[PDB]
Design a protein around this ligand. Sequence first.
Ligand SMILES: Nc1nc2c(ncn2[C@@H]2O[C@H](COP(=O)(O)OP(=O)(O)O)[C@@H](O)[C@H]2O)c(=O)[nH]1
Ligand SMILES: Nc1nc2c(ncn2[C@@H]2O[C@H](COP(=O)(O)OP(=O)(O)O)[C@@H](O)[C@H]2O)c(=O)[nH]1
Ligand SMILES: [Mg+2]
Lengths: 292, 95, 151, 280, 217
Amino acid sequence: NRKKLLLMGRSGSGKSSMRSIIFSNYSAFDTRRLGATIDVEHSHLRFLGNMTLNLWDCGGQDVFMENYFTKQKDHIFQMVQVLIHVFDVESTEVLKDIEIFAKALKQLRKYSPDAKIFVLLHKMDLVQLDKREELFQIMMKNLSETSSEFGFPNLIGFPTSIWDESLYKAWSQIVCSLIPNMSNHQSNLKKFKEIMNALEIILFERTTFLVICSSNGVLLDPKRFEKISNIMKNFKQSCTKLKSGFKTLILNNNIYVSELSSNMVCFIVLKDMNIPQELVLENIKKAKEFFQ
Amino acid sequence: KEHEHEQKLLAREQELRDIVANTNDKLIDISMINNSGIVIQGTDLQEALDKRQQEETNTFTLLSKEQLKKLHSNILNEIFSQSQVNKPGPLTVPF
Amino acid sequence: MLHSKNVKGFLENTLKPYDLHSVDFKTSSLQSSMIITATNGGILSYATSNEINSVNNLKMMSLLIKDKWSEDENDTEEQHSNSCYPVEIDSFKTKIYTYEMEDLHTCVAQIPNSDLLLLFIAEGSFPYGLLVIKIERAMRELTDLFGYKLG
Amino acid sequence: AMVLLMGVRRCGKSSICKVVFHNSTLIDLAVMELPGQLNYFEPSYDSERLFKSVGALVYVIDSQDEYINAITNLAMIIEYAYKVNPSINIEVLIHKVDGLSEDFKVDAQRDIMQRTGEELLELGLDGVQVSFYLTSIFDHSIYEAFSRIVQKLIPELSFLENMLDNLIQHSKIEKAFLFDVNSKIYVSTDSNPVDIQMYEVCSEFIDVTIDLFDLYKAPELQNVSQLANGVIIYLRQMIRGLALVAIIRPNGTDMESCLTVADYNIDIFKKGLEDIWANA
Amino acid sequence: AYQAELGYHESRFSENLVMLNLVEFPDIKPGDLVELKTYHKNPSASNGDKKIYFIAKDFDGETKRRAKTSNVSILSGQLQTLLDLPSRSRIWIKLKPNKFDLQADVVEFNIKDCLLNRGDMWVLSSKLVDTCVFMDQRLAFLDSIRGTIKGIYRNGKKIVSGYIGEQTRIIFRSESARLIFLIQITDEMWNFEETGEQLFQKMVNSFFPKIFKKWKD
Ligand SMILES: Nc1nc2c(ncn2[C@@H]2O[C@H](COP(=O)(O)OP(=O)(O)O)[C@@H](O)[C@H]2O)c(=O)[nH]1
Ligand SMILES: Nc1nc2c(ncn2[C@@H]2O[C@H](COP(=O)(O)OP(=O)(O)O)[C@@H](O)[C@H]2O)c(=O)[nH]1
Ligand SMILES: [Mg+2]
C-alpha cells in the first residue's frame, strides 16, 4: 500500500512549509527558517497503520523544473497517484505557472493517466479579505480550462494558507482520496452513531490530526472539521509541554475526544447531557477493536 | 465616618475568615473516602435494637390455618408480582 | 456494546414502589437505582425517583459503597453473616450485601460472573426483605448482561 | 478598578489592548488609552476626577527607542498623579523586549529604575513605589504583568490564596489557576510558584475549551483532559467571567475516584465563592 | 539515607535555595552538608538522576506555620530547572559529615562586563565559604556584579554541585578582558607549509576568523 504523491510548484510557493506543518510538526513561525529544496526531497510518512505515503517535495526553481520535463520525465511522473500543484498568488509570472502546470498535466497524462490532480492557491493571506474568493474563482476557471485540456475532467482546488486552518481541509481531502475501504469506515461510523445516539461522530488520524471521515458526510459551521483539526494540533503541542501525550478530552459531558485506537482519534458530539462518562467511555472501549 | 469604615473592614475580615473556615470544613480527602466507616452492615432487627437502645425476659408463652395459609401465599404472590420488571428492549446491541 | 436507553428504562422501572391491595401497606419509591463498576466504583448508569450536585453526591455514594463492598468480596472469615443473601440463579453464584448509610438503606449485588454491580438505595423506613426480593427479581431479568466485562 | 494605559505614540498601547482584551473591579473592562506627547501639562484642566477614577495607572516605555525623555514625561505625570490621590498604584511596562539578551534586559531595567528613582528624588516625591515589568506581546510576559496589576486591585487576595491552597491540599492538585474567560489574565493561584510552562498549558487549554465550545452552539463550562501519564487538567466555570483550571496529579490512584472527589471539592469551593462577591 | 517529599517556594517567603524541615528527621543539625540525591541504588542517566549538595537551613516561619507536607523545598528559577522534578516527588537525604574532606578543588567563575579588583575577587571568594554551589549558578556581588559557576572539580571529576571550603582553589576567569596580540612579521611568514599554505594565509584565513567566531559564540 504505497502511495506516490507529487508536490510541485514554483520557487517559494511554500510546498516544504505545507510538508513541515502537516507532517513534520512545525509551527507557522518555524517555516521561515526553511531553506530551498534542491532537486526532489523524498519523505516516507506512515499514515494510519497500513498506509505509506511517498511524498516528493519537488524543487520548483527554473533549472529543476526544466530538468523534470526533459530528462527525469520517465521517473518522476510514473506510478503517480496524486499530484498537488501549489500556486502562489504573489507570483507575477502567472502565465508561466499555468504553462508549467500544463506541462505537468501533459506528462502525467502521458505516463500515469489514472492520477488525481489537486491545486492549492497558497499564500492567500496577503490578499485583502474582500477580494479572496473572487480571485480563487478567477484563476480556477482558467485552471479548469487547462485541466480539461490535458485529460483530467475533474480538478479540485483549495484556497490555502499556513496562517489559517484551510491547509488541514485541503490535505485531509487530498489524503482521503487514497485511503482504502472508506465505505466500510462510513458504514461502521453510521452504525456507531446510531448505537450511541450521537449528533455527529468524526474520525481523525492520530499523528497528522487530519479528518478521515464524518458521520454526516440546528445549522452548523461547514468549516468545523478543519477548525477542530487546528485546535487538536494546538492542544497536542500544548500537552507536549507537560512531558506527556494527549489521551482524552470531555467538554460539557457532550463532546468526547478519545484515542479510539493507536492510529485514529474519535470526536463524538452526543445529544443528551445526562449520560454518565463511564458508559460513553466503555462504549468507546468496546468499539476500539471494531475499527481495527 | 472612616472609623465606621474601619469597623466595617473588621466585620469584613471576620466574615471572610468565617467564609474560609466554612469552605475549609467541607474538604474531603481520599483517606476520608477509604476509611469513612459510614457504610456499615445494617439489618432490620439490629436497627430496631439500636432504636430501642437510643429510646431507653421471655415475653412469649407457648400454648385459622386456612385463612393464614391463603393470606401468606397471597402476600408473597403480590410481592413477587410487582417485582417483575420487563425490559423495553435488548440491553446489548451487536455490530 | 451497550445501550444506555434500555438500561435507563430498566433502572427507571426498578424505581417503581409497592402498593399492596390485600393488605393496605404503601411503600415509598427507592431513592436511587444505579449500575456501577466492580473496579473503580463509578457510575455506569443511574436513575433517580425524582441536579449536578445530586449526581456528584450519588457518585460519591457509589464510590463509598464499592469501597465497602471490595473488602467484603475478598473476605472469607465470618462468611455465615446474617446480612449476606447469596443467591444462585441459572447456575450463577453471587453474593448480595445490605448496608446502612446513616438514614439510607443501600443494597448492592454483583452481577454474577461479571465486573458490574447493581445498587438500590432507599429511605430508612424501607424494609430490607423487600429490597432483597426486589434485587433478586431484578437480577433474574438481567440474563443478557451476564458475562460482560470492561474493555 | 479601571486602569489607564499611558504612553508615547507608537509605543504599542493599542496593540497590547487588542492582543490582551480582544484576542467594575475584576472583569476585563474597556480600559482607557491615553496618547501622551511631549508638551507642557496644563495645571488642573478638569483632570482631577479622571485620575481619581483610575485604580492603577500603567505607563508603557518602548525599549527599542530612546527613553530618557519618556522617563521625564512619566515623572511629570506621576508628579500630579500622586498629589491628587495618594492611593494609586503606579505601574511601568518596558515593552518590546523580544529581541534582547537577558543581561541587556536586566541592565535596561536597572537603568530605567535608577533614572526613575533619581527623577522622583529631584521632584521631591516620597513614599511612592513604582513597579516595573518587562513585557512583550509575542510571549507570556504581558499576561503576567496584567495579572500582577489586576491582583493589586482585588482586596480579597489572601483569602482567595487560602481557599485555593486548601482546595489544592485536599484534592492532590498540582497547580490551580483562577483564570478569567477573556484576556487569559489569571486572578489567583496558590503559594506555589507560577511556572511559565504550566501557565501556558492552562492558557491554551482555555483557548481549546472556548474554541471547541464555540464550534458547536445553539442547542457552565466543564472540562476533563487526561494525559498519558495520568495527569489531568480540569476546567469549571466560576461566577461571572471567572473560571478554574487545575492540573491535578493522580499519584497512582483511580482516575474516576479522583475525578469524583475533585468535582465534589470544586463544587464546594464554588459554593463558598458564591458567598464572597469576588465576581465582577 | 532518608526519604523526603520535594517542594517549591517563591522568593517572597525565603531567599535560600534549599530548605528542609528540621523537626522531621532530627539527625541533621542546623549547620550541615546534605546531599539531595533523587536515586536509591542503581543510578539512572537516561531517566535523569542528580546529586545536589547543599547546606541545611530551616523553613520560614510563614511556610512552616501554613504548611503542606513538602519536607524539602527548593527555590524556583535555576535550581528547579536543573533538578527538573514535579511539585511533589520522592527524594533522598544523607548527612555527609566530612566538610573538610568533601571540599571541591577548583570552582570556576565568570566576571563578564564588570571590573573586579584582585581584592574584590578575594572578598567574593571569602563570602563563598561554607556555601555549596552548582553549575551555572548566577551569583551576585554588590547587587550588580554577575557570576557564573562554570565548572566544579573534585578528585578529577567535574561534579554538578560541590561544597566550597577553606582549601578550595576558586578561580575567577574573565569573559570580558583586555587582550594584546603580537604578530611576528619575519622571513617565515611568506614561506610555505608542507600542504601548500603560506603561514600568514593560515593566520588571516584560519586562526583569526575561528577565534572571532568562538568569541561571538
Ligand atoms: N506570509 C506567508 N508566507 C508563506 C506562506 N506560505 C509559505 N510562506 C513562506 O515561504 C517560505 C518557505 O517557502 P518554501 O516552503 O521553502 O518554498 P518551496 O521550497 O518552493 O517549497 C517561508 O519563509 C514562508 O514565510 C503563507 O501562506 N503566508
Ligand atoms: N516586535 C514587537 N513589536 C511591537 C510590540 N508591541 C508593539 N509593537 C509594534 O508597535 C506597532 C503598534 O503600535 P500601536 O499600538 O499602534 O501604538 P499606539 O497606537 O500609540 O498605542 C506595531 O507595528 C508593532 O510592530 C512587541 O511586543 N514586539
Ligand atoms: Mg522546498
